Amino acid sequence: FLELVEVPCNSVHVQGVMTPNQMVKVTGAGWDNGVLEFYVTRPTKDTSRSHLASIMCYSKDIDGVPSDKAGKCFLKRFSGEDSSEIDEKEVSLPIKSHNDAFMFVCSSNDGSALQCDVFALDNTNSNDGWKVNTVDLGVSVSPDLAFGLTADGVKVKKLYASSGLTAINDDPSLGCK
């Protein structure tokens, strides 16, 4: 959307702060097993990182997932001061299954709040089209935010950021290649 450039790495690490209206995009075709986690981390303030926010999606198509979790997604917020968990909350997102294709598109409208558009193509009925819901992550932009996925076997993971965003593209520890 607009001028998105692929980030040749495994996650999107922003240099500095996100100005308003730039975007980062994380896409995949699904995952193999377990929970899908979309993360936003920030630098801890020795040079380590801490979660700022997390979206965890439980597949409706894996036997044994609790009935109160299966096919649901949850937003976990963390304190931007002591890295403490503030709260968890169910959020309405179109990702229902680990066989769905999906995209996360995150931006800050005013340089302060972070929100993401979450797109999914439901595998269990891929004959409907794409669906999208927007989620406010309920945290504020900090310098040097990182965005990515943590999951067992994400299929065809690709990453993009706005042209005007400074994204790390040469750190071998981020799988940059």
Author numbering: 48 to 92, 96 to 227
Paper text:
In this study, we report crystal structures of M2AP alone and in complex with TSR6.
The optimized crystals of M2AP β-domain alone (we referred as M2AP hereinafter) and its complex with TSR6 diffracted to high resolution (1.8–2 Å). Thus, experimental phasing with a selenium derivative was used instead. The crystal and previous NMR structure showed that M2AP has a galectin-like fold comprising 13 antiparallel strands. The binding on the M2AP side is quite rigid, as only slight variations were identified when comparing the complex structure with the M2AP-only structure.
